[PDB]
Amino acid sequence: QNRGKFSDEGALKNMFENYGLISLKDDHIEVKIIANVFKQMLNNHQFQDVNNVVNALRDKGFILADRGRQTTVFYHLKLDVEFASILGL
Amino acid sequence: TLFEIGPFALDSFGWKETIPKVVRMASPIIVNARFSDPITGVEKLIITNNNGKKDIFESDILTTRNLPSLIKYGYSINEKYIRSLSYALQLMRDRLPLSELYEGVGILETPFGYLISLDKVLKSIQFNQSSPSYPIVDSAYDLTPKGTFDNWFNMYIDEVKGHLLLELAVIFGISALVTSFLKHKHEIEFAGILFSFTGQSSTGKSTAAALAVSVAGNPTKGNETLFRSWNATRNALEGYLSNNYGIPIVFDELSSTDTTGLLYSIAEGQGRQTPKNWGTSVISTSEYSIFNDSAQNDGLRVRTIEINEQFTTNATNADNIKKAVALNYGHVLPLVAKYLINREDEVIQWFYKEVDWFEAKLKDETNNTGIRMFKRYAVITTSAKILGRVLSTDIDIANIRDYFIDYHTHTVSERSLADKAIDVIIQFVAQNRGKFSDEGALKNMFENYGLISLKDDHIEVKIIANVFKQMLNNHQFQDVNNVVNALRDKGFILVFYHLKLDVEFASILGL
Amino acid sequence: TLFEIGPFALDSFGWKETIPKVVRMASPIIVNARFSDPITGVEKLIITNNNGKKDIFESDILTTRNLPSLIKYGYSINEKYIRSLSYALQLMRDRLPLSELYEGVGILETPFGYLISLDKVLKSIQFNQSSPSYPIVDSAYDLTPKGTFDNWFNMYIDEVKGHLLLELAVIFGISALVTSFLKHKHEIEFAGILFSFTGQSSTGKSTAAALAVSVAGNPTKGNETLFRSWNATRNALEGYLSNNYGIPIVFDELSSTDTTGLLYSIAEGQGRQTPKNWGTSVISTSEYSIFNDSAQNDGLRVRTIEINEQFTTNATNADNIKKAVALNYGHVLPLVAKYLINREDEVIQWFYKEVDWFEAKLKDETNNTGIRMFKRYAVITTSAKILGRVLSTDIDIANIRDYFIDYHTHTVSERSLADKAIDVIIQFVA
Ligand SMILES: Nc1ncnc2c1ncn2[C@@H]1O[C@H](COP(=O)(O)OP(=O)(O)NP(=O)(O)O)[C@@H](O)[C@H]1O
């Protein structure tokens, strides 16, 4: 929905509002998303604790091991690769 | 003939008066003790029978208007004789001496020392020696022991021992009475800690929570118990805590309740509008943090400790614990009480040893608010040692010390406005980079937040004051000056604040 | 036989009546003094026994409907004789003279002068001379001394003396009575200052706050004390301040409470809807400013002074103070009271000296609202001098003067609508 605010070439060059950085990787898509934005999107979909969701996500290997702002700048999410067409990758 | 005055006489069959005919007035109605409340002036009375019935009334029960209401409480009265009977009972309490009524549970303050009020009342060496009378106390909970110490201890060995967090849970519960005891001795100034068991669903929170309060009384939902929910008004939560200085209580599940003020309220036994006053420790349970929808305030993280770890190892462990405490409770804290009373100096010295250990192991903390946690970690370890002696079982104090040394270091950035704030700021720049210009001029034709410049091993971000204030309000900070001043001290800082950010952000910020 | 009329008699064992037979109808019940409220008309009574029990009732306690309720208050009554017993107690109070009841704490206004109501009651040279009565006062707090002056003073030397802000904190607390005393003398028109201890968490605020009120009474949380919280309605905050014109009170932690309106209310003893009227100084404590969520009004910054500095030097400094004041309190302000009473002219001249000093040191202030702070800084320094005499210790008055000259100069642009406004404007343009 907010693809417009994720830049591809490593720099946050959306002049109106930046949510993160998106990169097509080998059989996964790296979506780096700003923490605050991640918190807000969770409150808005009626999650009520970030950390719980974060570790929950990490256990299935959605967020990865020790790269990102975990539980104890960005969250580093990996998404299934073949979404790449629709995400304009 | 248990009592007589003038024409009125009390025997084991009741009251009677004599005239020129001897008539029965009432069932046995006995006045055992009167009390006088200083500020109000209002007197109170213990009214009994010979079948061990005990009730406390305001003395105006003895007016002819009110006395028949004793029939509600099981007595019998002949209202043809209410006027005398009212007078006879007044005469009876006149003969009584003035007594004093202490109300509450835990450590009760007394001009003749202190009491420990639990289910029975435990007097201290200072008080026992100093008062020439039996103290009288309002029980003020259930707390009556169910089952055996043996069973409780058996589940302790089988389901708790060797498990750090489930051990903490037992410590925490006795640490209410211990903490309160130390405040009473002015060895600490805080009167208790708010503990919050958080984490994901089905992980033993409400279980360890019941385990914690099984120390002094009923850990189940019911009439008058230590296991309760957030489901009520502030009027009644605060109301159930009233006159509590040593009993742990559980508030289970926030979900069934903007919490800032309430957190504070707990740490300090202040009621609303006379006030209800307490000084005890309280365990919360929730699927979401309590610093979630709260101010970004340091004083909040200080009088609160939140454990976000799984307590029980498996589903059976939990189901085994719950069953054990529902059936056996209230056996440990009396032991802790006797221990506090008979080994007072010993505990105070223990506490000193622990405070000194924590001070020494954390001598790198400059932050005032971090030094403030020192005496808090050290009431818990001190409480652990007593748990150890009392149960006569081995408890690894090293692991509990270290657990908190490890809790501290991972909570350092959260007692520091500077660290919390610089964080929203970096993402604010990242997120709203579009509104920060590079070439010195505010040339965003929609909205300008500031100016950004790549400097030598730092990035200069000049940000408009108003914008800086507004973002802080939006992330639930509540004083600019405070945040600014905090940031200025770690060397982070009429138009802009001049922020310096770590250089290697330069790539993503398009510098 | 302490009293008699007709067949009704009061002996040391109680009341009794006689007929053509003598019956006992009540415990010792004594009417010691009556008062009459002008606007209301309603009379009041001091009812006692032989054991120094004292309570104030509206005189309608003596009606046969109400009198039995004295049994709640420990007395004994034979309700076979309530109709008589009511009349005798009426009769007894007819014999009493009219007295006047002054209610409150601090400086109590009297047509025969002024009183200082603390825990005991201190008469002034003007009052002592003119009326033939033992004044009767509603104590209206605890304020009873605990421990020793010596301990409090030892804490003062060991933990306070030489430390500016912790010294102010003691000054501020006694300055309630002094400020009020000066208003009463029309040497100032404001009745008190709202003080706000702000700054970061764990910096001695609630400590300096207890330190401040230990001058007049209990500085700890409890039944009836000077250390309280924001946790209530406006209805009860205002209600606890009622009839207070000289005792400092602490409101601890805003966090457990758009504040514009409440600030004003404090500076002027204005209740809501009769009203509760006060005139005292009050200390707030908070991790965030009170001018945070308030109007951009000058009149707000004027009747409030906010200290955003650390009070205690280290963590032990605080803990020693809290412990010292919890155990020893209420010894200083009585001294200040006696000093005010026996050295009235001296204090007023002192005050003048300070006001003129500040006027001279700040003769560049054109801003009306800044000149208005002059007499405020000067009640505080004046209070410091009295603290100095009273404790018999040296207090550097220069440092307290200059602290406020420096408070002033760094708060100038906040008393200036223009300076705040041009500041919002440049950023609005940017
Ligand atoms: N460690 C565990 N592993 C798996 N299941 C568990 C565990 N602990 C508890 N459960 C299950 O959860 C049930 C209730 O546990 P409980 O102590 O109430 O945890 P809880 O955190 O309070 N649940 P909730 O109130 O929804 O957050 C038990 O009867 C078990 O079926």
Ligand SMILES: Nc1ncnc2c1ncn2[C@@H]1O[C@H](COP(=O)(O)OP(=O)(O)NP(=O)(O)O)[C@@H](O)[C@H]1O
């Ligand atoms: N100057 C200080 N330096 C370091 N720690 C301090 C200092 N003053 C107080 N503390 C710690 O803070 C505790 C109580 O703080 P307190 O005097 O109430 O300040 P405070 O401003 O009221 N804290 P808060 O209510 O959270 O804003 C003491 O027992 C110490 O542990």
Ligand SMILES: [Mg+2]
């Ligand atoms: Mg649960």
Ligand SMILES: [Mg+2]
């Ligand atoms: Mg405080």
